Every structure is written in C-alpha cells, then in structure tokens.
Amino acid sequence: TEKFTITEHLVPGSHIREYPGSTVNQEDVLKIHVKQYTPKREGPVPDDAITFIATHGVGLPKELYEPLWDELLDQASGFHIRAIWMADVASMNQSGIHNEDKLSMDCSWMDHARDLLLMINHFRDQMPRPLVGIGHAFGGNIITNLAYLHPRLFTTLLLLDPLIQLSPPSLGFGTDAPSAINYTLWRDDVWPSREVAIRANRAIMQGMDPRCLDRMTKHFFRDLPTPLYPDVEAIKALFGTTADSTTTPVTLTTPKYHELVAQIRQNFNARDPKTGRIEVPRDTHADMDPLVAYIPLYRPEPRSTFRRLETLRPSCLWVIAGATFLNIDEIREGVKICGSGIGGSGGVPDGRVREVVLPGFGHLMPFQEVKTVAETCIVWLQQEMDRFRQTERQWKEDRDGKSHLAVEENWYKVLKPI
Amino acid sequence: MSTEKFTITEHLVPGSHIREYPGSTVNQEDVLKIHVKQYTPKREGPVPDDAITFIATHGVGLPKELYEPLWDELLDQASGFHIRAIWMADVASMNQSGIHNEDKLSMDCSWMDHARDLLLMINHFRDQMPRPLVGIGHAFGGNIITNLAYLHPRLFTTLLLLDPLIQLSPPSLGFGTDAPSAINYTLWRDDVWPSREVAIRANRAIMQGMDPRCLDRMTKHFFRDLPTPLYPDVEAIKALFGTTADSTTTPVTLTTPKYHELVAQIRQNFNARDPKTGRIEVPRDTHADMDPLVAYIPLYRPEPRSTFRRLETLRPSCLWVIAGATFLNIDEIREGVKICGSGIGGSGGVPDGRVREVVLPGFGHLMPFQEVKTVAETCIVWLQQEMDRFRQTERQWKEDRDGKSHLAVEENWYKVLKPIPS
Ligand SMILES: COc1c(C)c2c(c(O)c1C/C=C(\C)CCC(=O)O)C(=O)OC2
Numbered sequence: 064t065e066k067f068t069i070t071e072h073l074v075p076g077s078h079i080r081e082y083p084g085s086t087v088n089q090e091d092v093l094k095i096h097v098k099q100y101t102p103k104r105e106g107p108v109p110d111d112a113i114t115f116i117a118t119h120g121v122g123l124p125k126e127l128y129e130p131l132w133d134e135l136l137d138q139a140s141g142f143h144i145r146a147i148w149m150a151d152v153a154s155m156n157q158s159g160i161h162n163e164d165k166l167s168m169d170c171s172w173m174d175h176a177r178d179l180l181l182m183i184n185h186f187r188d189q190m191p192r193p194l195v196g197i198g199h200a201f202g203g204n205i206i207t208n209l210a211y212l213h214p215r216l217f218t219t220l221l222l223l224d225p226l227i228q229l230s231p232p233s234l235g236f237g238t239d240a241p242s243a244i245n246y247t248l249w250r251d252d253v254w255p256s257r258e259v260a261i262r263a264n265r266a267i268m269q270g271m272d273p274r275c276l277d278r279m280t281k282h283f284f285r286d287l288p289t290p291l292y293p294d295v296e297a298i299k300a301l302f303g304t305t306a307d308s309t310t311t312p313v314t315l316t317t318p319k320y321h322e323l324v325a326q327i328r329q330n331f332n333a334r335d336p337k338t339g340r341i342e343v344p345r346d347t348h349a350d351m352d353p354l355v356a357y358i359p360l361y362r363p364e365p366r367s368t369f370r371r372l373e374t375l376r377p378s379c380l381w382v383i384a385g386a387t388f389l390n391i392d393e394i395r396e397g398v399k400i401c402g403s404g405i406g407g408s409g410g411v412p413d414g415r416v417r418e419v420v421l422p423g424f425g426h427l428m429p430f431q432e433v434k435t436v437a438e439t440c441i442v443w444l445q446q447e448m449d450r451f452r453q454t455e456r457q458w459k460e461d462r463d464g465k466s467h468l469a470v471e472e473n474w475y476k477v478l479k480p481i
Numbered sequence: 482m483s484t485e486k487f488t489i490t491e492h493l494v495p496g497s498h499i500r501e502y503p504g505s506t507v508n509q510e511d512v513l514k515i516h517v518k519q520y521t522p523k524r525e526g527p528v529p530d531d532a533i534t535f536i537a538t539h540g541v542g543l544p545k546e547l548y549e550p551l552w553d554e555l556l557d558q559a560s561g562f563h564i565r566a567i568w569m570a571d572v573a574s575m576n577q578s579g580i581h582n583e584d585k586l587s588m589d590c591s592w593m594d595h596a597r598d599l600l601l602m603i604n605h606f607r608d609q610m611p612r613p614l615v616g617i618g619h620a621f622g623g624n625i626i627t628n629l630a631y632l633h634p635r636l637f638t639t640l641l642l643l644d645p646l647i648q649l650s651p652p653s654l655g656f657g658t659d660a661p662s663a664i665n666y667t668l669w670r671d672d673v674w675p676s677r678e679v680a681i682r683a684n685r686a687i688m689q690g691m692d693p694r695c696l697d698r699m700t701k702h703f704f705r706d707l708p709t710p711l712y713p714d715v716e717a718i719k720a721l722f723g724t725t726a727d728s729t730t731t732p733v734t735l736t737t738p739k740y741h742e743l744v745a746q747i748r749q750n751f752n753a754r755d756p757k758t759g760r761i762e763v764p765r766d767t768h769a770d771m772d773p774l775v776a777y778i779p780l781y782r783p784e785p786r787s788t789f790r791r792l793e794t795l796r797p798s799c800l801w802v803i804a805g806a807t808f809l810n811i812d813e814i815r816e817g818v819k820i821c822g823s824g825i826g827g828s829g830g831v832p833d834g835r836v837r838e839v840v841l842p843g844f845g846h847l848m849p850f851q852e853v854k855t856v857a858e859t860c861i862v863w864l865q866q867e868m869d870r871f872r873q874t875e876r877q878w879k880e881d882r883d884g885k886s887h888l889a890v891e892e893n894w895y896k897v898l899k900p901i902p903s
C-alpha cells in the first residue's frame with residue numbers, strides 16, 4: 064500500500080472439503096477474502112508482467128505481507144509486477160470471520176490449493192502468463208500442492224520456510240519438548256482490552272518491521288462478541304472489568320482452535336484396543352502413513368508433499384530460515400530431490416532449484432527481515448524471467464507457420480500406414 | 482430434448498485457465514468451453530436426499546450422446562439408489578465442444594486438462610450437485626475421471642471405469658515388427674465423404690455390433706456437413722468426388738477431426754535423442770512428463786503410465802469393467818486393479834472389498850454401445866453395494882459427531898497434548 068492500489072474480493076471456494084468435519088454441513092460454500100495489489104503506474108502494463116499468487120502461514124493475516132510486497136516492487140529489476148493476489152485461508156484471518164457460522168473443527172491444507180485454482184479461473188482475464196507462486200510456511204506446502212494440481216500454471220515458485228518434511232513435529236510425547244503446537248492448544252485467547260492483548264503478545268512482535276507492527280495489532284485481535292466469545296459482559300465479569308463500560312475485550316481473530324487443527328490433526332482411533340496394533344481407519348484417515356500413526360496426532364501434507372517433490376514442474380527457490388524450528392535437514396533433502404524425476408523441472412542438476420539458507424533468520428523472517436527476503440526473491444526472479452523470455456521466444460519461433468488444423472509432415476514419416 | 486427416461490439441459494461452461502501443453506490452443510490464454518448435457522430423470526416423487534450425481538467422461542472421438550442408452554438402462558434398472566442427474570461433457574477438442582472451440586484449438590492435447598475442466602464444471606453447478614457424486618469414465622475418460630479423483634480425493638463416493646486407459650506399456654504403433662494399431666489408422670484414415678450415407682459405410686468398423694439407439698446417435702453426431710475449418714470449400718470437395726451436378730448430396734467430414742483424435746491418442750516425441758551421443762535426454766521444456774524408459778520411440782502417451790503409478794493412492798472405491806476382447810494391455814490392467822487404493826490416500830483396495838474387476842468375456846472396447854443392458858447391470862450391482870456402505874458410513878459419521886462443538890476442540894486434545902512447562 065506504499066506502492067499499490069488494493070482491491071478486496073470475496074470468492075467462493077472449492078465444493079466438498081477434503082475432511083467432512085471442516086464445516087457444519089458438507090455442501091457449505093466457504094469464501095476466501097482476497098486482496099489484489101496493483102502497482103500505481105503511469106505507463107501501460109508490460110506484456111510479461113508477473114501475476115503473483117501468495118499464501119500465508121497459519122494464523123498470519125495476509126496484510127502482514129504488505130511490506131514484503133512493497134519491497135518486491137521497490138527492488139524489482141528485469142521484471143514487472145502485474146499484481147500480487149493473497150487470500151486468507153477459509154478458516155483463518157478475514158476469511159474465517161466471513162465463514163464463522165460454517166466452520167468446524169478440521170482443516171485440510173489441500174482445500175486452499177483447490178480454492179486458489181478456482182480464484183485464478185475466476186480472475187483469469189487479469190492473470191495472463193506468467194504466474195509465480197509465493198508460499199510462507201504451510202502456505203509453502205499449499206502453493207506446491209497447487210503446482211501438483213496444475214503443473215504448467217506457475218513459471219516458478221518462491222517458498223519461504225515451507226512446511227515440507229517427513230518427520231512429525233515435536234508434541235511433548237515422552238521426553239520430547241512441548242512445541243508451538245502444545246502452546247497453541249493451551250494459550251490465553253481472550254484479554255480484557257486490545258492494549259492488554261498487545262502487551263501479552265510482545266514475544267510474537269519482537270523484531271517485527273515497524274510496518275508489520277500496526278497490521279499485527281489491528282488484524283491479530285478481534286473485538287468481542289465472536290461465536291467463541293458471544294457474551295461481552297460475561298468476559299468483563301471473568302476479568303472483573305464490569306465497571307469500565309468503555310473498553311471491549313478482544314480475542315484471537317483466528318481462534319487458537321483453527322490454528323491448532325491446521326498445525327496438526329487428531330489420530331484418536333489408530334490402535335486396535337485388543338492387539339494394540341496400528342490399523343489405519345480408512346473412513347477418516349486414509350491419508351495417514353501407518354509409520355506416523357504411532358502417536359494420536361499427525362499431519363499428512365508435509366510428508367505426502369515431500370514424497371512428490373521429484374514431480375514438481377515449476378523451477379523452485381527454497382528460502383530457509385537458518386534458525387527455523389522446522390526440520391531444516393529434511394527440508395534440504397527436499398531441495399535436493401525437487402524436480403529431479405518424471406514431471407519435474409530438472410531440479411538442482413539443471414539449475415532449476417536453489418536453496419538460500421539465511422543464517423540467524425527465524426520462521427517470521429517475511430515480517431522481521433523484509434528487505435533481505437525481498438532481495439533473495441528478486442535475484443531468483445530476474446534469472447527465471449530471463450529464461451522465461453528466451454524459452455517463450457524459442458517456442459514462438461519453433462511454432463511459426465505450423466498449422467493449427469492438421470499435424471506436421473514428420474507424423475507420416477514415423478507412423479506407418481495400413 | 483429427451484432420452485427415454487430424462488429431461489436434457491445443454492450448457493456451455495468455460496474450462497481450465499492455461500492448458501497443460503502450450504500448443505493445445507492458438508493463444509495460451511484462450512478460454513476453451515465444454516458442451517455439457519445434464520440428464521434429469523422425469524420423476525413423480527421428490528428427489529431423495531442421497532440421490533447420486535454422476536459425472537461421466539467419453540472415449541476419444543466418441544460423442545457424449547452415444548452414452549444416452551446406457552443412461553436410460555442405468556435409470557430403468559436402478560435398485561437401492563436414486564439418480565439426481567447424469568452430467569457428461571464433450572472434451573474441449575472433440576465432439577460438440579470442438580465445434581464451439583474450432584477457432585481456438587491447435588495440434589496438442591493433455592488428458593489432464595479435462596480433469597480440471599470437470600472440477601470447474603462441478604464448482605459451477607455445485608448447488609445441483611450435493612453428495613454423493615459418482616464418476617464414470619470410458620477409455621481415456623476412465624483415465625481422466627481417475628485423475629479428477631487424484632485432484633480431489635473425497636469428491637467421488639465411487640468410480641465406474643469402463644475399459645480405462647490406465648497401463649504402463651506404450652500402444653502398438655507399427656514400429657519394427659509390431660502391428661499398426663487404431664493410432665496408425667487414425668493418422669492415415671479418409672476423413673471426408675461425398676454424402677453421410679457414404680461416410681457411414683466407410684466407418685462400419687467403429688459401428689459394428691452397436692445397439693440401434695447408439696447407431697442413430699453415431700450417424701447424427703460422428704459426421705458434420707461441410708463447410709468446416711479443415712474443409713471450408715463445399716464446391717471444391719463436390720468437384721473432387723465428381724458430385725457437382727447432384728444438388729441432393731452434401732459432403733460430410735469427421736465431427737472430431739482425425740488430427741484431434743490422433744493428438745489425444747498419442748503425442749510427438751520428435752526430439753528425445755542427443756544427436757552426438759545418440760543417448761535419450763528428455764527435453765524438460767516440452768517433455769518433462771515423459772518417462773525416459775518410453776522415450777526410445779518418437780511417440781508417447783504419458784497419462785496411462787503416470788495414472789497407473791499413482792493407483793495405490795486412489796481414494797474412491799473403484800469398479801473396473803473390462804471388455805473381453807479389449808485392445809488394452811489386460812494383464813497390466815489386472816496388476817493395476819490389485820494395487821488400486823492399497824496405499825496412502827487409498828480406499829483400502831481389493832483386501833477391503835473397495836476394488837472389483839468384472840472382465841466380461843468376448844465384449845469389445847465399445848461395450849458401452851454394444852452390450853448396453855449388461856454394462857448397466859454390472860454398474861447397478863456395484864452401485865447398490867456402494868450406496869448401502871455410503872448410507873451406513875454417513876449415519877455413523879453423524880452419530881460420532883453428535884455431541885461435538887464446531888468452535889473448540891474436544892476434551893481428548895487436553896489429555897494427549899501436554900502444556901508448555903511454566
Ligand atoms: C513445530 O512446528 C511444526 C513442525 C516442525 C511440523 C508441523 C507443524 O504443524 C508445526 C507447527 C506449525 C507452526 C507453529 C506454524 C506453521 C505456519 O506458520 O504455517 C507439521 O505439520 O509437520 C512438521
């Protein structure tokens with residue numbers, strides 16, 4: 064918004080959710096809240112200007128990414144931005160508010176891939192090639208699954224600390240340390256005032272770019288009443304603030320429960336009570352690897368996504384936070400195999416995949432190190448746009464004066480008659 | 482319009498933005514449309530709440546209307562399920578869709594595009610398509626509907642695959658000692674005739690043994706009167722055939738140009754060998770989807786092989802209806818049946834009774850048009866078993882969910898997930 068016009072949209076998402084308990088009724092129409100960022104521009108839009116399709120991390124409002132968009136435009140070299148499109152996942156942020164009477168206690172990351180495919184088809188007239196995907200965290204997983212759904216859709220992908228790995232998270236089982244997931248279930252989720260909520264959440268905002276701070280305090284917290292906290296006076300009574308009629312309690316805009324059921328999924332029925340043996344229940348958990356069913360929580364998408372990486376068609380930049388809490392070593396094995404097999408870009412051996420590990424940077428680097436994250440993206444984009452322009456030109460040259468109606472002469476040389 | 486048992490509604494709906502192969506259209510941003518027929522039973526009573534929405538896909542160059550007698554038979558013989566409606570689209574490059582798109586089509590075809598076209602169609606008509614949905618695919622349509630199930634695992638309750646093109650081996654293409662196949666025939670075949678009566682006789686192989694109801698639809702839909710883009714000059718063709726004096730005959734051509742059948746049956750692989758080493762080097766700009774193991778010949782078809790390799794992940798239950806006297810690699814198909822749904826994402830497959838093969842001795846690739854009543858009967862037996870399972874699993878789901886909050890997680894979460902140490 065330093066550099067862009069913002070257009071808001073509310074678009075219907077994918078019919079029939081991957082998990083039946085993700086909505087109140089299985090036919091519910093979830094909507095996604097989209098912001099479209101169009102650069103303020105005197106001249107006409109260049110013909111190869113990029114359409115960016117961006118996805119956020121769990122519980123992170125799309126508006127937090129606006130400084131990154133400003134930096135991408137400010138530092139753009141050898142490419143133009145037609146527009147950046149970022150949607151809130153249906154169960155989170157502004158989308159979750161719009162869908163609040165239809166949401167329920169489940170979440171598949173795959174649904175947002177289908178929601179985005181629908182969005183792109185809805186706005187196709189404003190989204191000519193080239194398209195580029197950007198995904199942060201579970202958004203990195205989602206944008207990769209969109210590339211699996213539609214291999215030639217994206218020219219390239221920009222993954223920012225993507226949740227693509229094999230190993231389950233730490234969940235405090237046995238000797239394991241409780242993780243952000245344990246924290247999410249048990250965390251405070253309501254405060255007597257926005258001022259108290261902001262002070263109580265100093266940790267998540269430490270190191271944030273000042274431009275992100277204002278967006279965080281506005282979007283991360285929501286005034287009561289909400290469906291989870293429908294009674295303002297009952298919460299003032301809980302905090303003993305009833306006498307202050309001027310102040311409104313706030314809650315997490317994305318309920319902690321909607322963060323939680325995106326971070327991890329219940330596996331409460333995997334063990335035969337007689338044999339003690341794991342038997343995957345296919346009615347509810349067909350997508351669960353029996354090897355991860357040993358604990359009563361799982362997350363299928365990081366592992367399924369990792370195992371399909373050799374098929375990833377677009378070129379792919381993996382920007383990894385050196386101080387991430389994700390399994391950095393598994394992520395780097397993902398980089399190595401990415402695009403190397405059938406359907407694939409050609410991967411690291413063809414120079415179609417690169418890792419940049421940013422030492423000392425954390426998971427929230429898109430809000431803490433906006434300029435360096437943008438710079439890393441721009442270097443890759445200028446190389447990929449050079450390759451795009453050359454391969455597009457060579458395509459047109461090779462197609463020049465070929466028929467649209469009948470096959471070329473070589474067919475009659477290779478395929479014998481009867 | 483009407484079949485024996487159904488109201489027909491026609492639709493023209495935009496397909497998927499950006500085609501899998503750039504040469505499948507004149508311009509890469511072209512908006513292809515799919516011509517859809519929606520078949521709604523003529524019905525006295527209200528529509529039951531579990532009535533099935535069928536999404537159907539055809540074989541290469543086979544007009545959707547050929548499937549209408551099969552739809553009539555499904556409805557006439559339906560037992561233990563109701564039909565909400567049957568929806569069948571023509572693939573963008575074929576049949577009525579190809580006519581609508583004729584100025585935008587070009588010489589390439591990915592089967593994966595029709596899977597995305599159908600996903601868009603279902604979302605467009607979602608208000609008329611509550612669960613349960615069931616997929617039906619014939620031949621390359623069997624491949625397509627399976628890839629739709631890969632795109633959206635929980636979309637279909639079950640799939641009905643009629644001689645699906647899912648196997649590992651390339652087709653026979655007359656290389657070396659190999660017999661030429663229907664693919665060789667497709668490139669070289671006559672594709673224009675002085676009259677529809679002559680065109681019917683020239684096409685007798687594809688029509689032999691057809692049910693009379695399918696024959697009438699074939700003679701109406703398989704041929705198109707000139708002019709067309711490929712044959713834009715009626716008088717030039719009457720001159721070629723010596724029928725200029727005869728005002729009573731109009732030349733006809735294939736409704737689906739032979740070239741659009743051909744580029745669906747097989748894809749050029751004209752640049753797979755390093756000219757220096759003679760070694761196969763898959764060119765990733767054009768052939769990223771090509772297995773180097775099938776790149777030894779200058780033609781390939783990726784989708785049967787990719788689809789086969791993902792079968793263990795197929796979520797819906799799956800009926801494999803195989804023609805006795807099919808042109809498919811029947812032994813590879815039977816290995817596909819064995820693994821179908823057996824892995825991660827999968828139904829549970831043959832060991833859980835979620836996958837069944839019915840190989841009908843002596844039947845033919847075109848069995849959906851030649852043995853309509855028996856094909857319908859095979860489908861109905863499977864559908865009644867699957868709908869019993871659907872009703873039971875839906876009831877058990879509702880029962881298990883009955884106590885539960887939509888807003889907050891159940892108590893068990895606080896038992897399994899310990900708090901952070903204070
Ligand atoms: C402990 O961190 C993990 C790890 C290692 C894994 C998963 C997971 O959910 C979390 C919590 C995810 C968080 C806090 C934010 C994600 C985002 O910003 O999108 C998982 O699913 O497999 C591996």
Ligand SMILES: COc1c(C)c2c(c(O)c1C/C=C(\C)CCC(=O)O)C(=O)OC2
Nearest residue numbers: 540541620621651652662746782785808
């Ligand atoms: C000779 O038949 C084959 C075989 C065996 C294979 C393929 C193929 O394209 C054809 C021709 C395809 C047709 C006739 C389409 C049929 C339809 O869809 O009704 C393939 O890709 O692997 C195996």
